[PDB]
Amino acid sequence: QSLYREIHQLISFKDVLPDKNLLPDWSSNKNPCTFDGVTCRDDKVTSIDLSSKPLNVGFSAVSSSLLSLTGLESLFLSNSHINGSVSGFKCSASLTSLDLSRNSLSGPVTTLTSLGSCSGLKFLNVSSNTLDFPGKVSGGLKLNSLEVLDLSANSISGANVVGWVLSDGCGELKHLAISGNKISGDVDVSRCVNLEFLDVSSNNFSTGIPFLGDCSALQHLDISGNKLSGDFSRAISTCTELKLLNISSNQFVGPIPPLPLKSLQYLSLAENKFTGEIPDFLSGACDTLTGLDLSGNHFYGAVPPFFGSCSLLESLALSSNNFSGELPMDTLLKMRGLKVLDLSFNEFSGELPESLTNLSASLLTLDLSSNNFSGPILPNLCQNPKNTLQELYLQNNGFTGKIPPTLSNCSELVSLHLSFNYLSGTIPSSLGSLSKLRDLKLWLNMLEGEIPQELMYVKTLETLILDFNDLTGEIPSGLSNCTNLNWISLSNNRLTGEIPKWIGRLENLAILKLSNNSFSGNIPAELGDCRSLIWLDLNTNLFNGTIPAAMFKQSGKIAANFIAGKRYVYIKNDGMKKECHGAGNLLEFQGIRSEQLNRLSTRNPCNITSRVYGGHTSPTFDNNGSMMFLDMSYNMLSGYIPKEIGSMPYLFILNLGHNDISGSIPDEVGDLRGLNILDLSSNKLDGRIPQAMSALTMLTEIDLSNNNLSGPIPEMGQFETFPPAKFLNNPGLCGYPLPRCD
Numbered sequence: 194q195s196l197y198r199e200i201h202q203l204i205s206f207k208d209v210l211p212d213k214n215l216l217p218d219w220s221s222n223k224n225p226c227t228f229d230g231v232t233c234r235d236d237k238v239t240s241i242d243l244s245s246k247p248l249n250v251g252f253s254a255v256s257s258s259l260l261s262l263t264g265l266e267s268l269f270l271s272n273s274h275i276n277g278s279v280s281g282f283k284c285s286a287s288l289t290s291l292d293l294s295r296n297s298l299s300g301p302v303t304t305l306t307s308l309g310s311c312s313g314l315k316f317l318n319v320s321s322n323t324l325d326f327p328g329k330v331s332g333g334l335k336l337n338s339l340e341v342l343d344l345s346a347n348s349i350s351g352a353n354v355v356g357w358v359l360s361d362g363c364g365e366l367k368h369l370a371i372s373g374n375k376i377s378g379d380v381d382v383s384r385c386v387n388l389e390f391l392d393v394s395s396n397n398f399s400t401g402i403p404f405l406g407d408c409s410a411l412q413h414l415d416i417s418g419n420k421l422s423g424d425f426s427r428a429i430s431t432c433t434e435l436k437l438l439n440i441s442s443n444q445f446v447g448p449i450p451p452l453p454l455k456s457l458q459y460l461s462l463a464e465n466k467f468t469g470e471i472p473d474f475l476s477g478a479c480d481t482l483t484g485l486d487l488s489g490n491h492f493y494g495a496v497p498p499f500f501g502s503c504s505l506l507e508s509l510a511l512s513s514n515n516f517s518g519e520l521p522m523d524t525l526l527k528m529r530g531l532k533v534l535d536l537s538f539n540e541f542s543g544e545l546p547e548s549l550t551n552l553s554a555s556l557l558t559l560d561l562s563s564n565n566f567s568g569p570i571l572p573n574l575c576q577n578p579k580n581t582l583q584e585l586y587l588q589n590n591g592f593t594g595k596i597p598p599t600l601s602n603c604s605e606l607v608s609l610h611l612s613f614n615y616l617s618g619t620i621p622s623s624l625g626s627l628s629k630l631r632d633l634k635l636w637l638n639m640l641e642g643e644i645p646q647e648l649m650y651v652k653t654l655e656t657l658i659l660d661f662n663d664l665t666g667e668i669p670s671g672l673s674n675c676t677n678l679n680w681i682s683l684s685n686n687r688l689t690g691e692i693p694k695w696i697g698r699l700e701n702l703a704i705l706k707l708s709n710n711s712f713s714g715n716i717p718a719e720l721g722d723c724r725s726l727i728w729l730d731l732n733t734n735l736f737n738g739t740i741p742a743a744m745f746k747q748s749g750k751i752a753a754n755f756i757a758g759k760r761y762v763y764i765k766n767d768g769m770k771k772e773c774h775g776a777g778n779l780l781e782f783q784g785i786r787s788e789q790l791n792r793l794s795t796r797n798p799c800n801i802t803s804r805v806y807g808g809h810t811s812p813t814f815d816n817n818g819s820m821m822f823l824d825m826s827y828n829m830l831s832g833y834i835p836k837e838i839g840s841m842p843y844l845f846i847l848n849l850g851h852n853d854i855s856g857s858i859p860d861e862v863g864d865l866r867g868l869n870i871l872d873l874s875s876n877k878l879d880g881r882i883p884q885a886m887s888a889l890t891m892l893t894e895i896d897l898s899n900n901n902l903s904g905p906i907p908e909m910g911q912f913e914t915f916p917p918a919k920f921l922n923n924p925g926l927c928g929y930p931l932p933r934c935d
């Protein structure tokens with residue numbers, strides 16, 4: 194307790210740190226109560242917080258210098274790069290809280306039994322470490338005094354690990370968390386009569402439901418993300434005080450069983466296989482319910498009317514079921530607190546309820562996507578003094594009419610998604626007033642007119658998806674102002690003009706898809722200034738001139754990390770139909786059912802059956818990438834292929850077919866390691882296939898037909914795997930699959 198001991202113990206810790214500048218104001222002839230990270234009371238150290246500092250030392254240093262400090266009551270070393278493992282040590286009787294979370298502690302969890310030296314320990318967070326339970330489950334943690342224990346996000350695989358933790362007693366335990374491991378077996382917390390919080394989620398529990406005994410204090414029960422299928426209703430029947438029940442992402446079946454509803458605030462049965470209709474007994478929860486999630490089940494029927502009495506409800510998730518019918522406009526108006534309404538992926542029908550025109554003052558997310566709704570979009574939505582709606586998802590319905598210009602009064606809008614409908618008219622110029630909008634998606638509609646110049650006022654715009662409409666005119670120069678644009682998709686319209694040279698100012702542009710339009714002029718070399726471009730599809734236009742060598746300037750220097758995480762669809766071209774152009778169509782696909790892709794048969798000549806790939810967008814690099822997709826087929830390009838085309842290691846697809854390209858194939862093609870598809874067919878190419886193409890080991894498809902190439906086909910490589918039709922109409926070429934070179 195002397196200042197001598199305190200300073201020497203604390204400075205001895207600093208003097209084992211690899212980087213001592215992490216504790217710069219810790220100095221030996223200076224009172225510790227003036228140190229950053231120290232907490233004092235009456236000139237005595239009571240707590241130390243060095244969290245989020247890269248200390249890079251072992252637990253042995255912490256136990257010898259800090260945990261032994263007399264009077265220390267708490268030590269917070271979360272995310273501090275403490276490795277090693279726990280061992281015996283002398284612990285201050287005053288220590289009540291120890292936070293060693295988000296570190297690299299290792300060894301068996303039995304190491305934690307030596308923390309019993311801390312006679313006063315009541316709180317222990319050793320989550321996000323690498324502790325394990327190798328071998329057989331035996332003994333006990335023997336930390337009876339703990340009130341809060343978090344062993345989550347470790348490497349604990351085993352059966353009945355919970356029994357080991359609770360073996361020596363759990364009368365004082367109020368909060369137990371063991372999520373994110375691979376624990377299995379039994380969970381008996383019947384003796385833990387003061388347990389208020391239990392989180393055994395994201396484990397490998399596939400047998401019995403936890404035994405909660407009398408359940409007299411349990412307020413929070415989280416068993417989600419396992420493989421449970423038994424009778425949870427009976428196990429929780431006596432739980433009178435339960436406020437949160439999350440049983441989602443399990444293997445439960447059958448109808449919604451009886452539930453304890455007296456105190457229930459949050460309930461999630463999502464991502465299971467429950468069946469039936471929403472039972473009316475749940476009405477008994479409308480006095481307390483603040484959140485409900487029944488998504489990802491096999492529920493059906495209509496939304497019951499008792500939801501009108503659920504006035505405290507702030508989130509109603511019912512998506513991905515077989516719910517049907519029109520929704521009650523009389524029940525929604527009573528949910529004054531509802532801030533999330535997700536009804537997506539069902540078969541609700543009818544017109545939008547006028548209730549929404551009122552709920553626009555409390556809602557942040559309105560998701561009705563992938564339903565059977567019809568009629569016009571509410572022309573009076575967001576008429577309230579303060580409209581808080583941030584996300585409007587109405588895509589993949591049967592909505593008709595015009596896009597209401599009133600939507601600009603939704604000032605807080607961040608995402609507008611009206612794609613896959615039958616909307617007509619123009620893109621309202623008033624949308625330029627949405628100063629916070631990031632996503633404007635309206636593709637597969639019947640929109641006409643031009644792209645509003647007024648989008649120049651939306652500095653926050655990131656995605657502009659307008660494919661498969663009837664838009665005309667040129668690309669408005671006002672988009673140069675939208676400097677955060679990373680995804681621009683304007684395919685299958687009737688647009689004209691040129692690619693403006695100001696495209697180079699869009700530092701964040703990753704995807705530029707302009708196919709099947711009437712764009713013309715030369716390819717702007719300024720495309721080479723786009724530091725983020727990874728997907729350029731210009732197929733089926735009227736572009737002319739030569740391919741500028743400068744496009745590939747940023748090659749190697751590209752680093753698009755911003756686009757990652759966006760739902761998409763890629764419709765591969767079979768090549769069996771001559772009306773279908775291009776390698777394939779990359780299309781945004783948030784909140785849309787792949788089943789409705791057959792709506793495209795009236796706009797696209799391609800066959801979609803069994804050709805649809807999907808996922809969330811994921812670039813193959815982070816910092817030193819190149820262009821991944823380049824399609825400029827079916828234009829009128831001329832000149833030679835710049836040898837800088839081979840500068841892109843990450844290019845998967847290069848489609849330059851159906852042009853007037855001249856010259857010879859530069860040997861640099863062979864440097865395109867990742868090239869899965871390459872065709873230069875229907876062109877004016879000359880010479881012989883560079884022998885360096887044998888470096889290409891990832892080709893699944895090549896087409897060099899309809900050219901004037903001569904000479905032998907490279908003998909090594911993948912060239913022999915391809916049929917002769919991929920080399921046909923080239924009088925000078927010979928060698929298997931063709932006749933051997935005479």
Ligand SMILES: *[C@@H]1O[C@H](CO)[C@@H](O[C@@H]2O[C@H](CO)[C@@H](O[C@@H]3O[C@H](CO[C@H]4O[C@H](CO)[C@@H](O)[C@H](O)[C@@H]4O)[C@@H](O)[C@H](O[C@H]4O[C@H](CO)[C@@H](O)[C@H](O)[C@@H]4O)[C@@H]3O)[C@H](O)[C@H]2NC(C)=O)[C@H](O)[C@H]1NC(C)=O
Nearest residue numbers: 321346373394395415417418437439440441442459461464
């Ligand atoms: C009801 O129950 C469901 C199912 O359990 C919950 O839904 C899941 O919730 C989690 C948590 O939000 C969802 O995603 C999770 O994200 C985490 C990412 O954050 C961590 O990692 C990043 C990156 O390192 C760090 O920046 C950050 O600080 C965190 O450390 C993951 O930790 C989660 O686990 C997954 O990733 C980790 C990576 O360390 C792995 O160890 C895990 O095994 C796992 O792969 C997790 O992904 C998760 O997707 C949701 N699942 C669904 C909806 O199906 C509900 O939230 C819950 N609702 C309640 C209680 O109301």
Ligand SMILES: *[C@@H]1O[C@H](CO)[C@@H](O[C@@H]2O[C@H](CO)[C@@H](O[C@@H]3O[C@H](CO)[C@@H](O)[C@H](O[C@H]4O[C@H](CO)[C@@H](O)[C@H](O)[C@@H]4O)[C@@H]3O)[C@H](O)[C@H]2NC(C)=O)[C@H](O)[C@H]1NC(C)=O
Nearest residue numbers: 271272292294295317318319320321341342343346368370
């Ligand atoms: C044991 O330690 C772990 C690791 O630190 C810890 O897990 C982390 O908890 C925090 C808080 O519970 C999580 O971060 C929060 O996450 C939610 C949404 O997931 C946000 O609401 C939070 O931000 C709001 O609240 C903050 C106040 O905490 C405000 O500062 C902020 O402005 C927002 O209003 C916040 O981000 C975090 O995701 C986890 N997981 C990690 C870090 O991996 C765990 O809670 C600890 N356990 C115990 C029992 O103490």
Ligand SMILES: CC(C)[C@H](C)[C@@H](O)[C@H](O)[C@@H](C)[C@H]1CC[C@H]2[C@@H]3CC(=O)[C@H]4C[C@H](O)[C@H](O)C[C@]4(C)[C@H]3CC[C@]12C
Nearest residue numbers: 728763765777806808809810811812813845869870893
């Ligand atoms: C970085 C983002 C923008 C991306 C959209 C990313 O998310 C996707 O994963 C992206 C990399 C995916 C979407 C479509 C895929 C192609 C689909 C296809 O027809 C395949 C045919 C054959 O099987 C070949 O061997 C491999 C081929 C060419 C595939 C390469 C990888 C692609 C491009």
Ligand SMILES: *[C@@H]1O[C@H](CO)[C@@H](O[C@@H]2O[C@H](CO)[C@@H](O)[C@H](O)[C@H]2NC(C)=O)[C@H](O)[C@H]1NC(C)=O
Nearest residue numbers: 210211249250251252274275276277278297299
């Ligand atoms: C904890 O981290 C430290 C620092 O990285 C590790 O120490 C290094 O260990 C390697 C491998 O044994 C040695 O080659 C280095 O010379 C060590 N350097 C320093 C500065 O420590 C330490 O091994 C880690 N501890 C554990 C248990 O993994």
Ligand SMILES: *[C@@H]1O[C@H](CO)[C@@H](O[C@@H]2O[C@H](CO)[C@@H](O)[C@H](O)[C@H]2NC(C)=O)[C@H](O)[C@H]1NC(C)=O
Nearest residue numbers: 575576597598599600601602603621623624626
């Ligand atoms: C958003 O709502 C306000 C409030 O109703 C509308 O205000 C009108 O603004 C025009 C000029 O733009 C005035 O001539 C009208 O008298 C206003 N009507 C009022 C105040 O009731 C505004 O037009 C709406 N904006 C959009 C794009 O629909």
Ligand SMILES: *[C@@H]1O[C@H](CO[C@@H]2O[C@@H](C)[C@@H](O)[C@@H](O)[C@@H]2O)[C@@H](O)[C@H](O)[C@H]1NC(C)=O
Nearest residue numbers: 690711712713714715735736737738739831
């Ligand atoms: C490229 O094309 C430019 C525009 O040509 C005119 O408009 C296009 C859309 C077509 O309709 C075409 O027939 C028209 O003549 C020309 O100005 C330019 O010179 C062309 N460049 C080259 C290298 O041919």
Ligand SMILES: *[C@@H]1O[C@H](CO)[C@@H](O)[C@H](O)[C@H]1NC(C)=O
Nearest residue numbers: 350351375376377397399420
């Ligand atoms: C989880 O349990 C299953 C059996 O239900 C087993 O096959 C699987 O290997 C286990 N996985 C783990 C512990 O990661």
Ligand SMILES: *[C@@H]1O[C@H](CO)[C@@H](O)[C@H](O)[C@H]1NC(C)=O
Nearest residue numbers: 493494514515516517518540
């Ligand atoms: C879903 O509900 C609708 C409307 O009641 C019904 O026509 C349809 O067959 C149901 N689908 C399934 C798979 O049960």
Ligand SMILES: *[C@@H]1O[C@H](CO)[C@@H](O)[C@H](O)[C@H]1NC(C)=O
Nearest residue numbers: 517540541542543565566567
């Ligand atoms: C959608 O609604 C229309 C009436 O507007 C109805 O005829 C049709 O069957 C509905 N489709 C589904 C799948 O419920």
